[PDB]
Amino acid sequence: QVTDLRSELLDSRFGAKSISTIAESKRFPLHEMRDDVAFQIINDELYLDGNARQNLATFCQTWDDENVHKLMDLSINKNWIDKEEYPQSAAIDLRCVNMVADLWHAPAPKNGQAVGTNTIGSSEACMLGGMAMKWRWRKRMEAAGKPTDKPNLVCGPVQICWHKFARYWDVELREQLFMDPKRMIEACDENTIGVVPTFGVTYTGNYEFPQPLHDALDKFQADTGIDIDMHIDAASGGFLAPFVAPDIVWDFRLPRVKSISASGHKFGLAPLGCGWVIWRDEEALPQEAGQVIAQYYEFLRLGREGYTKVQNASYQVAAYLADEIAKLGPYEFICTGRPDEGIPAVCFKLKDGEDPGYTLYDLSERLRLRGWQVPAFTLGGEATDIVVMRIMCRRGFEMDFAELLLEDYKASLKYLSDHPKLQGIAQ
Amino acid sequence: QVTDLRSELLDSRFGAKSISTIAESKRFPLHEMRDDVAFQIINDELYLDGNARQNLATFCQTWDDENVHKLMDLSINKNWIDKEEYPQSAAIDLRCVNMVADLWHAPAPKNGQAVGTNTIGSSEACMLGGMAMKWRWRKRMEAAGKPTDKPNLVCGPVQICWHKFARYWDVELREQLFMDPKRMIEACDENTIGVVPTFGVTYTGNYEFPQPLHDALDKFQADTGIDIDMHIDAASGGFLAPFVAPDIVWDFRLPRVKSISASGHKFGLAPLGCGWVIWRDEEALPQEAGQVIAQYYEFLRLGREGYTKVQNASYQVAAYLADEIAKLGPYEFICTGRPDEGIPAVCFKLKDGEDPGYTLYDLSERLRLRGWQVPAFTLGGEATDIVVMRIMCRRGFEMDFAELLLEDYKASLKYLSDHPKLQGIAQ
Amino acid sequence: QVTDLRSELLDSRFGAKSISTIAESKRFPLHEMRDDVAFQIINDELYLDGNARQNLATFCQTWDDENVHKLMDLSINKNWIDKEEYPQSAAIDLRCVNMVADLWHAPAPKNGQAVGTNTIGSSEACMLGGMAMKWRWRKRMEAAGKPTDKPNLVCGPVQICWHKFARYWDVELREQLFMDPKRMIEACDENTIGVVPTFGVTYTGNYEFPQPLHDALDKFQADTGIDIDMHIDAASGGFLAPFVAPDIVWDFRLPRVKSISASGHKFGLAPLGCGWVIWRDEEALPQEAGQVIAQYYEFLRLGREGYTKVQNASYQVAAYLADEIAKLGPYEFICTGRPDEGIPAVCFKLKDGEDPGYTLYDLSERLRLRGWQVPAFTLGGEATDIVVMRIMCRRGFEMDFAELLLEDYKASLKYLSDHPKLQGIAQ
Amino acid sequence: QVTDLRSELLDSRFGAKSISTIAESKRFPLHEMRDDVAFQIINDELYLDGNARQNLATFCQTWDDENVHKLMDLSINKNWIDKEEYPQSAAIDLRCVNMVADLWHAPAPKNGQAVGTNTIGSSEACMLGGMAMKWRWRKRMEAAGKPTDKPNLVCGPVQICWHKFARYWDVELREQLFMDPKRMIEACDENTIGVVPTFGVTYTGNYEFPQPLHDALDKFQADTGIDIDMHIDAASGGFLAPFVAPDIVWDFRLPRVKSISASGHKFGLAPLGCGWVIWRDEEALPQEAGQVIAQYYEFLRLGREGYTKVQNASYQVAAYLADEIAKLGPYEFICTGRPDEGIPAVCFKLKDGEDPGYTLYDLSERLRLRGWQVPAFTLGGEATDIVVMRIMCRRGFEMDFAELLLEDYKASLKYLSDHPKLQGIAQ
């Protein structure tokens, strides 16, 4: 009892009885071990997790500066949930709502504060905008006096964050890289909740433009009685276009856009995982604390100048990888990465014509051997045997890193080329 | 341009031109300032926020050791969203699901992995369990074949996390510290989705015991044909009773308990803000990453030993404050803080008979002047003019701190004792 | 024994038996506890102490950069007591004595090393200079040869750091913000040790000028035989005026100024709490280590450039608060805060005419509710009818902080405006 | 202009124009340099200062643990000066006063708080006690009615911290290792202020015992009318004997002892430099904040157990060095270092008989060559050609260090022995 306790006292962390056992799992621990052994046994499995620096499949953030770290450390616990218990965090939250609703061109608020909402993620943002539009539609059309059972929410080919809404909220849904302006309201002639055109969302890489379709909305209000609003689902374009392509018009510069939704952890440099919903004016919405601190710090420290600089760095790397991989092999880029037209990413498939002995699928793993989490994919359609690869570029992926990735690319190209029987490594 | 730039280079933190302006607000910054001045600008706001250590109105956590700090530091970015991209975080997630669904006594899972779900908060947990049992009821009673427009979900007098459900999910809801076992199913005997009795909820203090009502459920199954299940809403109880009062019956030890909901940031020592939902087994449920890792670390480091020691410390200090403030003045404690009956908290009101020259509203202010966020309240009922105070105890509230609070209490007593006109300071 | 000691080893700091007791007080501890639990026990007391950042009643320093911090860390123990054990600390000490005796315009020392002395505080400085000039007077006037029992040291109405001297050093104490040049020596024309006119000491805020009175000393030398020297008690003006207002005559630029006394922790940016005494040259004086080094670091890092920037920032925010609170209510500022005339502070009182339903005593309370230690006072005179408030500004008090104080000021205005029965909350 | 500025921006600390000049001195810096260059130029001269670890001439502290360092760095600003602005530091101050006045055996205070005073150094303590007993001597004498012009304060032969008092406070002073009990009052039969016998003072190494002289005091009270009190000047015995020699009686266990003075930075493990004065009870005294935090932390963390352990470690090292150096050469230890008799130190001279070719003056410098600041001295008496050396032992001087010191001793012994012309290296 005493001697083994003494050994438990003064011992190397790799000499104790506490560690030589397997980790706990299927039951609750009956006793307590030393905190350093627990810390080590946890740290090792996240070592096994992988290297997130080279994970090019994600858009979420990777790096944060020291001051952001200190700020989130200061704000670990306290919440903005209610009013006075922590009064300044809610104030800063309303400040950032003001700043974002300014950046996306809102009408100047009369009383002095904009209308918006911070959210945990983009899904909550989309669901909020959805039931908001549903509420105003039902209210005014009941003012009209006709009954309801068949409300179709148009557009949104593969977005499921809204299909969950339409699947649970009693909503029918009926819907080039995008849909033409006419068929849009061909399916949306009379009855409709809302029109949701994406903007730099994860699945549709490059912008699905709102100016071409707004002319449609206007002239089919002029033609037939139905006047329908919109909601842009800008998961990233909401924090890219106002810096690197300001002229192109997608915000409340148009009349009929009533609400806009974005995520701040993709490209808003906000670490935790956050989202924003912004409404045009009090008339828009119906009847009815750590991430804000880091986002406000980023807003102050960087501003339009620094944000333009960082997003232009990312677009630069995207252009570089595009051109060089283009002269690597027989590729056909669907998504190149120009600031005017899409988010900084490169999605490309093998040439229509030929197979170079090796499928793209099996190049991804020869890259993985080095630690590059570069993903290959197939799209959802009538053709199911064309396969693409996407190398998303983000903050914290410097040009040097792109060069090392391209060198490992080259090495993989040589290995598969020589040993030709690696043609079908993927399922 | 050059001279003031040189001044910008080598300057004290409080001599720069960038600081002497007011903070940003109603618009987006056009340029970028230096990181140090932005860091300070933010830091003094959180200074003005208040002192969270002495904020006794909250139940959420306050302090976390260094190991959990660096561990969450390591896991800041990565998420449990899917299997491949970060494989071990989801593994540890399912591990903690096993741990919890063990701690609340579940049937041993056949394949080897328990059923459950981690969530962002207790609200999502409550909503999820509610929709789940709604699906169960609708599907099976439609296998019976009779129409459904009259679903009354009973119990839960002041919980709004479920009133939001019943407000949006087309659900009518019809409903001593608790209600007697007979009237319970009186309101419920025929049509009913579920019965939700709380357990250590934020407003209700005492355990609303499920054993007395379970015999009721059984014998009105035996009497009338309706067999109705249950769902415990154990926000704080779920992580207290299995350590400091194990014998008391409340989890799946009873047959009809189909699901349990808890919050892990209240008394589960999990920092971020988390929740747990746990289902009995596969038959129950319908057809259709930083919190887990720190909660797993605390599970391993403390276990049953450490957790019992901690919650018993909290119950200890809660008993101490009870007795001493009891013989300070003419008080009537409704919530004392015994481990058998309630969460570690002390809620007391004025004696029914008399007023000691001062309300308990104004005593909160004379406590506040030194930083004690002790909240006074009024209860919800037909009688409005009886006021209470709650001095909730938690981890990180050592006993000498309690004696300090009591000394400041004494000082406030003397002060508003001498100057008797401070009788109606609160609105 | 063995089990409880095992528990003593593996335990959270809030589960240990050692903490669950009250702190020690009325006796010496017989045994020893662990260092972490004592560290926590102490830390929570300083938590309860208050927030020194928002304590505007003090003039002493609040913040110091990391370099001076780790520097005083390196110098924690060593002493400037003598040359033999630590020879360079005394070297830097004599260096900064040179620096100061320069900054206040001394005659160039022949040997190359100025005369002076670093001290622990301003009180010891005042006593030292007083005893020095008393020795001078007694020795020379006994070289004249007439008896000495009637020494009246004039000026210094409310300074007690000199009245302690005059209390036990056998000195008679004889003595429109300041006194006119004639009555000054009216009280003094024959027998007198010295004339002590302050220079923005703690109690008298704005400069009591020595130029107007020096012509007095000169021509009552020319008229009657008595030649009297002086000693400025510049507790703050000694480290403010030579940067932000240099043209004024107040140091040894005048002939009869024999000594100067200042404090280095007020506006000299020296952390510990220090003082300086400086003598004209060797003839004046009678026959008979962490502060210096941090003050030397700040001298080198900032110099005239940095110090000017800093004190001008403080005067800036002091003017801001003046104008804003001036247009808040019906106030009459006695001390505004112009660099030419006073230290950076704003002392104001109620208008002579009317009371706005609330005294300025009770406004300090509703400011305190948020943490602002803004002190209200009563003046010292034959008339106890006026109450004042002083909002002293210092390094570390950014301007956005000032606007935050102003917003809380506004809130207090509204509150005690609506509820009028708060007429006399202060004793 | 611009190119040199960009060079000053991107540059090693040893490539800038700022460093190539020597440090500032005889004047105030006109401009500001970079703070890192200033920090470096300060750091290197402290390098040149010396190594305080091997400075065995001092008794003051050398090392403090991490927690005391963080407490002091937390309190580097706040003061105990006044009651409200920092209320808890003063509370802890009176706590430590209670604990010290308990440790030295005071009568139990009736109200509950002891009488005492914290001070900056020992000098202020001695001066305070002196003026206190002077005041009582005066008031009692006034009641008796005889004039006071010849007050002699006995004892204190080489202490100057009291001779300054007697030099400025109009006090005549008339006064084996100590003076016999009879001659003490032989110089003090009738007129006397006080009797000051040291205890652990720096100059008189080993205790000047109060029990032998107290019988004297009692029986010359019984013999002639004069009843005279005492004051122990225990600069180090005050924090030594109550742990390592409790039975010996020198505190208020005796009646006539009215006050006791000590320093807390020598052996009280208090870093800053502090002192304590303690009075018997209210009847004793006349009619008219960082150090305490660290001393209170030491009191709690260590207590009687830890303090006994550390002082016994120091006495152990003192015994070891004594025996070993006695084995080295022909030495005659005057101060050996036994716990019953004196402070932990070893003072020794050369044997009266012979010179071993080298004096101990010149052995100290051959020790210095390695870094050992071991000092040699001569005493003030009738024969001043005997020379001693003292190796004071303290906390932070472990046995290993004593062994290395002895080895360097041995090496130096050989060098002087061989080269015999090093007879008179000291002045």
Automatic annotation (TrEMBL), chains A, B, C, D:
GO molecular function: glutamate decarboxylase activity; pyridoxal phosphate binding
PROSITE patterns: DDC_GAD_HDC_YDC (PS00392)
InterPro entries: Glutamate_decarboxylase, PyrdxlP-dep_de-COase, PyrdxlP-dep_Trfase, PyrdxlP-dep_Trfase_major, Pyridoxal-P_BS
Residues with PTM N6-(pyridoxal phosphate)lysine: 266
Domain of life: Bacteria
One cellular component (GO) term of this entry: cytosol
Catalytic activity: L-glutamate + H(+) = 4-aminobutanoate + CO2
The enzyme's E.C. designation: 4.1.1.15
Entries under SUPFAM superfamilies matching the protein: PLP-dependent transferases (SSF53383)
Presence of keyword Transit peptide: no
Keywords noted in UniProt: Decarboxylase, Lyase, Pyridoxal phosphate
Biological process (GO), any one: L-glutamate catabolic process
Cofactor(s) listed: pyridoxal 5'-phosphate
Sequence similarity: Belongs to the group II decarboxylase family.
PANTHER family with a match to the protein in the record: GLUTAMATE DECARBOXYLASE
Entry function: Converts glutamate to gamma-aminobutyrate (GABA), consuming one intracellular proton in the reaction. The gad system helps to maintain a near-neutral intracellular pH when cells are exposed to extremely acidic conditions. The ability to survive transit through the acidic conditions of the stomach is essential for successful colonization of the mammalian host by commensal and pathogenic bacteria.
Stated name of the protein: Glutamate decarboxylase
Gene: gadB
